[PDB]
Design a protein around this ligand. Structure first.
Ligand SMILES: NC(=O)c1ccc[n+]([C@@H]2O[C@H](COP(=O)([O-])OP(=O)(O)OC[C@H]3O[C@@H](n4cnc5c(N)ncnc54)[C@H](O)[C@@H]3O)[C@@H](O)[C@H]2O)c1
Ligand SMILES: NC(=O)c1ccc[n+]([C@@H]2O[C@H](COP(=O)([O-])OP(=O)(O)OC[C@H]3O[C@@H](n4cnc5c(N)ncnc54)[C@H](O)[C@@H]3O)[C@@H](O)[C@H]2O)c1
Lengths: 460, 460
């Protein structure tokens, strides 16, 4: 059985095949679209406070299967089990947060028009097709599904083909919570099935979290079909350390930022850009700290890293490492595939990385840190912006004025000053350039898939 | 000299050729992109209060050329001169309105993160490519250029090829205002030139106002190049009149909404949907009121209608009329091309228009009213939503509770209850379905082309 006919799960820690699922056929797609249309037709007529209570029911149902869900995430894509538990906890908390704060964000807006003639209303658009990746099989889905559904939309999930066990368990959680199947639904569609759905009148808009190549392929189809899209396409985030930085905190945040989820994070710290005076001190401490990370069986809580999720992607990452070394970089740690049946790649550090090199210009979606030396803060900003990507960034410096000035000139959607980069319900998430466009979380994720409707009475 | 090599202006009132302009070549396009990039680089570093003052300077420069601008609009596309003067006045007022209210819309936004650690900032995105139409040759440009430039972006205009006299005069106004080189620019690009610019890294995003066909062609290219777009496309707005309406006001608003700018308005009232009990009285009054509209030389202020802008589009509109009559509609007024050198089409009314007919399913972009009988309010809503378009809508009824319930169920971006549909800086503008996506004016038009950036300090 090959991906020509089936979605396939393999445990990356052992190489064992776990499950197969054939692609949806024509009747499957038509049935999914009929369900979603009928579900949205009814859901859009519910009251906002009823939907807020249903979000709480989702959170309860998810917590009641928290360990079942975490084990499935770890089994299918290799995440350390405590990181999978944290992903569940964050996803369930998102349900409660939007239940509490979401309704107010959807209230009608007053305008400056006289006599209170005109208000802005947030109406639902319809069924939103969501194309999602494997690195956070639960959180990526919930990050969009929770606000999208609270706004009165429907959500139709096309999950990554290596995590359909996760997809089926998520569907069970929504069923446990009483969400209609025509409001949260899912389909094991192949790429042609996605193309067919984008063209169908029962899909109102599209959201994509994935590679740059996937976003360009889907975004072109959404545009041709006159469907709005949001694209979140990963990153090559710079992590800038200046001479006056809190060095020990910078190293802690650098290691956490690069090696979380075995490096497989869109907003991971990927390009370390260090002012020349502090570069030796940072580099030696970073290598020693990265070397302290244990790697192995992700069911063993002693391990900070598991295997990488996909065997072919470990091969690609190692090729990127070899090309960067051939171009002139120095290997300071790791940098070889581990022998054995599991898909393991050790924490790896490359130094003397210049902007011409593979590890500076491509997304390194695994546990490989690139370290580049900057002449001064202006050079560091130039190096940080010298990227096709633009998702987020970190700056470590005790000069808070300078940090604020650099943040204003960084070409990315998030800037973390002297701390740990992360997504959070309370703030906007999303980038610029080839990292995509559109924003998720806070009120942005609620409004992206609304029909923002002016209602104006007595304009005479 | 054919459209294969040149943009051509022809006076629609007389048929005489006014000007020709060859398409931009490869060097012209490259030059404009280099200057846009350099202009944006410097402009994004200016202070918001400085850019607000420059918006006031634009308004002063525009008012200083107000009659010259109005006469150019009338000469190139046929609009009654007092409507051209109103377009200039509304456009200059927009500059002052955004100068006054825009800066507060771009101030950092607090979040619920503890201890005031995180804010949302509104950063410039880059140079925005703008593809614009001929029906409001000044207002369509200013509606976007003013907020786009205020937010620190650049603006690169590709105007419709029959209004390049207007385009050159607008550029003179921005030059008179002292707007720096590259912050406002324009190109006489053919469709291939637009394609080349969308793929170029010096264009950050795209905004399109035009036909559904143009939006789908350009939106597909923007998606493939990973560029955000805002699409403001056609409309076929319904105008619903229920039995309990203020009939005299409904007729006045119906005639104004259909026949403004000789019918050539995206959000014109195009499909009149009249409850059966009041249909006879509405129809007889509407015909009488439309018949009272004078048509002729648009330099003469007695004329409520001018010629249509484009000879080929009058031919298209009359073909749509003839098809609708052949399908079974009845002609109540007008419905024939006027003889002579001018491009005149009289105020026209079609009755017994059913949902299967051309004038119900296509945008009627000229002075042709379609009247459809609804059995009751629920049928009227069904008829109103039975369209590929979804820009805006009007409801006339003294039952305000029913009007607001219907508004919530109308698939469009603006609903006017018992009044006159129009765009206004203080409210959102834009639609759903094949009318496109994204919103203009108010804070929406300011924020659509910002990089919405989280800045978070001390996340530890
Ligand atoms: N969070 C993220 O932004 C993210 C996640 C995973 C991978 N990536 C990047 O992509 C690289 C490859 O990873 P992947 O191979 O897992 O990513 P991908 O982009 O192939 O997959 C993400 C989703 O898009 C779907 N998809 C891809 N191409 C499609 C198409 N043409 N039509 C319809 N659906 C399509 C996939 O089935 C999956 O659901 C990674 O190495 C990393 O660089 C980024
Ligand atoms: N929603 C709105 O805000 C709004 C406002 C005004 C007009 N409109 C629509 O404008 C339409 C009439 O305008 P037009 O007659 O200028 O229509 P059009 O779509 O032919 O052209 C509009 C612009 O698009 C450009 N264009 C068209 N096809 C293109 C392509 N393939 N590549 C690049 N550029 C391309 C044209 O040169 C022109 O600049 C009507 O549908 C009206 O509703 C919409």
């Amino acid at each position: 059985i090959t991906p020509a006919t089936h979605a396939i799960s393999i445990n990356p820690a052992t190489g064992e095949q776990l499950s197969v699922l054939p692609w949806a056929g024509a009747d499957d797609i038509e049935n999914a679209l009929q369900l979603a249309a009928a579900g949205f037709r009814d859901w859009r007529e519910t009251n906002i406070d009823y939907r807020a209570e249903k979000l709480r029911d989702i959170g309860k149902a998810l917590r009641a299967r928290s360990e079942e869900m975490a084990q499935m995430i770890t089994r299918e894509m290799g995440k350390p089990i405590n990181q999978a538990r944290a992903e569940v906890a964050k996803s369930a908390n998102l349900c409660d947060w939007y239940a509490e704060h979401g309704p107010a964000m959807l209230k009608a807006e007053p305008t400056l028009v006289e006599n209170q003639q005109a208000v802005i209303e947030y109406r639902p658009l319809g069924t939103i097709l969501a194309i999602m990746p494997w690195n956070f099989p639960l959180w990526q889905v919930m990050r969009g599904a929770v606000p999208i559904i609270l706004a009165g939309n429907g959500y139709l999930l096309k999950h990554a083909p290596n995590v359909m066990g996760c997809a089926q368990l998520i569907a069970q959680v929504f069923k446990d919570a009483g969400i209609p199947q025509g409001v949260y639904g899912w389909l094991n569609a192949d790429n042609d099935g996605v193309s067919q759905m984008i063209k169908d009148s029962r899909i109102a808009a599209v959201t994509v979290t994935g590679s740059v190549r996937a976003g360009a392929a889907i975004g072109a189809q959404a545009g041709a079909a006159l469907k709005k899209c949001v694209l979140e396409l990963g990153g090559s985030d710079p992590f800038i350390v200046l001479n006056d930085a809190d060095l020990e905190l910078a190293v802690k945040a650098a290691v956490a930022g690069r090696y979380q989820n075995t490096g497989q994070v869109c907003a991971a710290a990927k390009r370390f850009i260090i002012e020349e005076g502090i570069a030796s001190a940072f580099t030696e401490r970073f290598v020693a700290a990265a070397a302290a990370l244990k790697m192995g069986d992700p069911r063993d809580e002693e391990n900070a890293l598991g295997p990488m999720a996909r065997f072919d992607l470990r091969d690609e990452l190692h090729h990127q490492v070899e090309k960067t070394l051939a171009q002139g970089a120095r290997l300071l740690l790791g940098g070889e595939k581990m022998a054995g049946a599991g898909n393991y790649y050790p924490p790896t550090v490359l130094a003397n990385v210049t902007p011409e090199m593979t590890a500076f210009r491509e997304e390194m979606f695994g546990p490989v840190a690139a370290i580049t030396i900057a002449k001064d803060a202006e050079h560091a900003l130039e190096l940080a912006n010298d990227s096709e990507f633009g998702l987020s960034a970190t700056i470590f410096t005790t000069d808070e004025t300078q940090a604020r000035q650099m943040a204003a000139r960084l070409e990315c959607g998030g800037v973390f000053i002297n701390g740990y980069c992360a997504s959070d319900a309370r703030v906007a998430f999303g980038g610029v350039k080839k990292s995509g466009f559109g924003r998720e979380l806070s009120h942005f994720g609620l409004h992206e898939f609304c029909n923002i409707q002016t209602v104006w009475k007595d304009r005479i």
